[PDB]
Amino acid sequence: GPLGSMSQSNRELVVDFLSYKLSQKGYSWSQMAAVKQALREAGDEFELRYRRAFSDLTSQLHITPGTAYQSFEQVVNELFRDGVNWGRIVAFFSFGGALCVESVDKEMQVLVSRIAAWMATYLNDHLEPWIQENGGWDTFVELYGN
Amino acid sequence: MSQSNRELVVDFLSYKLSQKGYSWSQMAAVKQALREAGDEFELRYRRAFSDLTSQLHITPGTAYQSFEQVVNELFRDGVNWGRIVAFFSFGGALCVESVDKEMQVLVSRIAAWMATYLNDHLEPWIQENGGWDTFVELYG
Amino acid sequence: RPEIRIAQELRRXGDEFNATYA
Amino acid sequence: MRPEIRIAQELRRXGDEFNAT
């Protein structure tokens, strides 16, 4: 196996397992593990309730590697064109996840790695200012966690 | 904060991909197989382990020696993947027990003891037996 | 247009979602 | 009959049974 990250990776493996076992018993390993869990759960609930929003994204958007970036950016710019709330942020994550899954379904696998970067850039550049002003991710966990 | 936002994207997408049978990364796949095996291990042998962790009488003053004695006896005559699964499950059960008893300070100590044992005493076997990739193929 | 169509649905659904749990 | 050894020998047995399946 790969030697170059063994020390850190083995640490992350232990943390991941213990985070999971603690969560299963109603506990949280850390603030960040709790943000991650709340976002996974909110995304599950959003996709459960609004499933038809996500149907046939790649054919409706005519997604190709050459057009994916502009299509992604146009959707997110319209989503937030007139402001931000936590519910719209959940929609943003759920949209990116659906686009990744359906890009893989449609044999455009290279798009997963790019969407993830496009999502992180938009989060850091355009959503983080609002998030800081509105209580940080801890307030999202307060409002949306269990 | 920028790095935390990246990790949040990575965690969300890794989960969504795995829900549909796809994998973000090898590390994501090892973590998933380990979570699944740990759940299946505890499902089958829960009744056999009833009270056994309670019986260790975990305290801050005795936790380290109790942890070492258990893991040294577990691997006394060798390593296999099932005993490694048992090792992780044991550590998780010990962590849950610590919080239950209001000994939350033990969680980070237990996590370190597990990583140390994994790095120093299990990794040689793991390297010889296919790496974590072979674990994923047998248990994923 | 398709980008705007889906984005407006996401926006309307996000606000409704936002309204329920918080 | 030490509690540490009792849980460890159950972990080992169960571990080995799990490994075999």
Swiss-Prot record, chain A:
Domain remark text = The BH4 motif is required for anti-apoptotic activity. The BH1 and BH2 motifs are required for both heterodimerization with other Bcl-2 family members and for repression of cell death. The loop between motifs BH4 and BH3 is required for the interaction with NLRP1.
Q: What is the effect of changing D138A?
A: No effect on caspase-1 cleavage
Instruction: Give the motif span (BH2).
Output: 129-144
Impact noted for substituting D105A: No effect on caspase-1 cleavage
Q: Where is this motif: BH3?
A: 35-49
How the protein is affected by changing G87A?
No heterodimerization with BAX
Q: Which domain of life is it from?
A: Eukaryota
Q: In which tissues is it expressed?
A: Bcl-X(S) is expressed at high levels in cells that undergo a high rate of turnover, such as developing lymphocytes. In contrast, Bcl-X(L) is found in tissues containing long-lived postmitotic cells, such as adult brain.
Motif BH4, per the record, lies over 9-29
Q: What is this protein called?
A: Bcl-2-like protein 1
Provide any one GO MF term from the record.
Answer: channel activity
For this chain the motif BH1 maps to 78-97
Tell me how the protein is altered or processed after translation: Proteolytically cleaved by caspases during apoptosis. The cleaved protein, lacking the BH4 motif, has pro-apoptotic activity.
Q: Which family does it belong to?
A: Belongs to the Bcl-2 family.
The free-text function statement in the UniProt record for this protein reads: Potent inhibitor of cell death. Inhibits activation of caspases. Appears to regulate cell death by blocking the voltage-dependent anion channel (VDAC) by binding to it and preventing the release of the caspase activator, CYC1, from the mitochondrial membrane. Also acts as a regulator of G2 checkpoint and progression to cytokinesis during mitosis. Isoform Bcl-X(L) also regulates presynaptic plasticity, including neurotransmitter release and recovery, number of axonal mitochondria as well as size and number of synaptic vesicle clusters. During synaptic stimulation, increases ATP availability from mitochondria through regulation of mitochondrial membrane ATP synthase F(1)F(0) activity and regulates endocytic vesicle retrieval in hippocampal neurons through association with DMN1L and stimulation of its GTPase activity in synaptic vesicles.
UniProtKB/Swiss-Prot annotation, chain D:
Q: Where is this motif: BH3?
A: 7-21
Tissues/organs with expression: Isoform BimEL, isoform BimL and isoform BimS are the predominant isoforms and are widely expressed with tissue-specific variation. Isoform Bim-gamma is most abundantly expressed in small intestine and colon, and in lower levels in spleen, prostate, testis, heart, liver and kidney.
> What processing steps or modifications follow its translation?
Deubiquitination catalyzed by USP27X stabilizes the protein.
> What induces the gene encoding this protein?
By ER stress in a DDIT3/CHOP-dependent manner.
Cellular compartment(s): Endomembrane system
Superkingdom of source: Eukaryota
Q: What is known of its domains?
A: The BH3 motif is required for interaction with Bcl-2 proteins and cytotoxicity.
Q: Which family does it belong to?
A: Belongs to the Bcl-2 family.
The entry's function note states: Induces apoptosis and anoikis. Isoform BimL is more potent than isoform BimEL. Isoform Bim-alpha1, isoform Bim-alpha2 and isoform Bim-alpha3 induce apoptosis, although less potent than isoform BimEL, isoform BimL and isoform BimS. Isoform Bim-gamma induces apoptosis. Isoform Bim-alpha3 induces apoptosis possibly through a caspase-mediated pathway. Isoform BimAC and isoform BimABC lack the ability to induce apoptosis.
Q: How does it assemble?
A: Forms heterodimers with a number of antiapoptotic Bcl-2 proteins, including MCL1, BCL2, BCL2L1 isoform Bcl-X(L), BCL2A1/BFL-1, BHRF1, and BCL2L2/BCLW. Does not heterodimerize with proapoptotic proteins such as BAD, BOK or BAK. Identified in a complex containing BCL2L11, DYNLL1 and BCL2L1 isoform Bcl-X(L); BH3 integrity is required for BCL2L1-binding. Interacts with YWHAZ. When phosphorylated, interacts with TRIM2; this interaction is associated with ubiquitination and degradation. Interacts with MCL1; may sequester BCL2L11 to prevent its pro-apoptotic activity. Interacts with GIMAP5.
The name this protein carries in UniProt is: Bcl-2-like protein 11
* The species this protein was found in: Homo sapiens (Human)
Kindly list the organism's lineage. Answer: Eukaryota, Metazoa, Chordata, Craniata, Vertebrata
